[PDB]
Amino acid sequence: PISPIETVPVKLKPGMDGPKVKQWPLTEEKIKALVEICTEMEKEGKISKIGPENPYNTPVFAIKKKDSTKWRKLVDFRELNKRTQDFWEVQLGIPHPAGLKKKKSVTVLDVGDAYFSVPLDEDFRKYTAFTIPSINNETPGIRYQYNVLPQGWKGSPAIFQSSMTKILEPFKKQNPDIVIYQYMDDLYVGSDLEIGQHRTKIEELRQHLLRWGLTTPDGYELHPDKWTVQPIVLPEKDSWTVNDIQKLVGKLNWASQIYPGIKVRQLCKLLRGTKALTEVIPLTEEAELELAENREILKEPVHGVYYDPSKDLIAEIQKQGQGQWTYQIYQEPFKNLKTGKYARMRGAHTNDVKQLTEAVQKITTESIVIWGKTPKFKLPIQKETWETWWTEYWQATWIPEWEFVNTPPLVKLWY
């Protein structure tokens, strides 16, 4: 219910005002969902109607979870989070289980049903304002603010973290093998056991959470080992034209910003003079040395690349064509923490925005598992298109931040 607890007071960062984010228009199917849902929530004291004396707002919308179901609210607290983010202690519980990424399987649960117990600090409620829109602006918007900890607030798993440790203590004892990481609204649960077993030790945890009053759905299956970084590789075919060598050189020249031992001069030697593109050039030994030499640096992973906790994680995506998408995750230019591809598209799926939406989620749950932080995305799409269609494929309870860019001619340098 709403258990008699002292409201943990909370205060935005200094100098900063609460969110004032305009609301995106929603389809009718969605506005109905959000009207029902909020109606129940207001009945149960979870939220309250407010008037327009409250200048703050936060987008709302609705998604239809993973592998079908029936609607769910989702409040885009991005702006309020970064306006409130990491206060004092209570922060992201433990500095993230560095182990979890190693476990054979990881499963995800939606413990978000918690949070609706704990009241929210009086003087903060107003910063949680949110407004269900109206089709054709017929009725005014229906504004609610929160009274309990809200599902997407980041300040929520923080405040509730004392209690979740208690609830879980008994389970982690009877199971010191199994790793348990809370991020935002989900618990990431990773074992080493065999599928049938692991999936058993998950329900136990669901029932264990029930016996402490939490209640869950009734996410994904995740296999962290086997997230193999993708090493940059050079063309193999022998029959080099002046073109092939030119591409080759340009690429190695760029790739020399990542790996400092790479040399090009023996390949520029083969290209002296003003030759035509088509013209086949005999690969001299000294060159085929430099090329086998170089080929074998692009092999071993890099050194000098360590996560820096106080710095944002960035993530670039490039459309590669055949339903393939390449991405890299990094914190300063050219020092990649990970690089991967994502594919698996044909027929009843081919839809740039859909694939890009799926990749953005998968990349993001890789980051949560590997560092306990979501990456600020660089999306190869146009603001309008993306803002127009993303909530149609979203199935996750968090939302990473993102920017919009024009992919350079470096789609090439990765694949």
Next chain:
Amino acid sequence: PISPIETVPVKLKPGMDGPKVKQWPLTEEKIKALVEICTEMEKEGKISKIGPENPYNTPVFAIKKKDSTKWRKLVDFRELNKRTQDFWEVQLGIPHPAGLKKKKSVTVLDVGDAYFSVPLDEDFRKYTAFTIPSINNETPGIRYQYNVLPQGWKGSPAIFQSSMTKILEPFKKQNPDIVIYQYMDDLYVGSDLEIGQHRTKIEELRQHLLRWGLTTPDKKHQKEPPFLWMGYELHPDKWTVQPIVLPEKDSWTVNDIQKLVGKLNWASQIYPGIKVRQLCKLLRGTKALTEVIPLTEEAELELAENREILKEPVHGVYYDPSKDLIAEIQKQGQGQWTYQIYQEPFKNLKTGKYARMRGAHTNDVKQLTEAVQKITTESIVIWGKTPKFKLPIQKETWETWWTEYWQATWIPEWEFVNTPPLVKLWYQLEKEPIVGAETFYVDGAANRETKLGKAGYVTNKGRQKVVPLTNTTNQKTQLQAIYLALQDSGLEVNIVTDSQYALGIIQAQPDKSESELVNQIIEQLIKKEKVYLAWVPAHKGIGGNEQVDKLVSAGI
């Protein structure tokens, strides 16, 4: 009267203070028109003289105006407005006629006075004080203060609309089939009740309104087929917009103009092409809202084109939820796009012209896509669903494009409409270098100081060019050199550049561009049969590039 609703609490801005703007009065004329309008309002309870003295103050420049012998007071809350807390705008836009459905009966009550019938936060009236002067250029004088939502105040439509949706909630509960929509002083009441029962609800509602201090006219406007809601004309089977006339007067008081921005941007939601983001500048700050202001060359131009768009009335049908929505787009005057949204042929709900253009170098397919998006957003906003599209483009033109575009794009469900000018790709670049083509090594250079440069090329057939340039920049000579190569070569050519800049633009495949130069390159591009553009790093001594570089470099 004055509604008994509970007031909305209203704070002055974070660390701020009320308007202490002293009155600039004295006219000995019309200072009598006030105190008559005031002492009437003082009786209806809308204001009251302030006891224990001081302070704060707002102007009261009253303009009786050529309303045909009328006396009108006009508090200027412009400065109080800047100190009042922000409010949330709870609507995404003004409603659109086409978004209405057919109802057997509709009525449009005019809420009488309204802002004037909702009380003001008690603690906040103090800051709404004003003054009426007298003979003795000394107090004497007289000092009032508002008890109800003041006319120009910043919070008066937000608060008023909140007070109203409150007052109605009970009535909407007992009557779930009646639909009431509010918009300022107009209240639309649709229903599928027999003409007779309706009129009775409409009476029950007028009483509810009255018990809550809200009066609604019984002589009812001039209700013929033209029932008027929000300045639209609703007929059981169509809506029409009353062509707006923008009167030409040079008595353009700061007010009269301030009222023009209101009317014009109300119109832009019905009419595509209204610009008002210009003459707004004929304001900014506080400059006596009676001070006749002269038309500039910047605003008097556009306002002149405005009368032109509003010239021709607009109309359309109502929305029926059992049918899909179909949107059709056609290409017009290069970057000009027309579109219609309908459900039954020839029966349009809404038509428009989209122009915009996105970037400095665009093309037709991406430009179309932009329109398919804007139109999509519109459909969700007005009807909350997505339309099916008919488009001047071939499944295979779109197919090859997205499948060779580094960015990601997408259009919902669509159908080829074989129509006037089709949208097509005005050329394509080779993916491989062409065999037996003069391989052009291009390059330019500019001296950021003197602003001089050169652009030139070198081929694998001994052909060379170097052109001296005045007032260019590096990235401009990079495009210049590419142009040379294009124009001095056969139908089939291989160009090789070191400018990732120049390479970006060309690889996008623009057919229109901001820069004239890029156009000349565009022109040249389509005149060719086969073109293949290549990139290599500067200063690696790569054969060809190295020679061209040296050649154009008596600048570097």
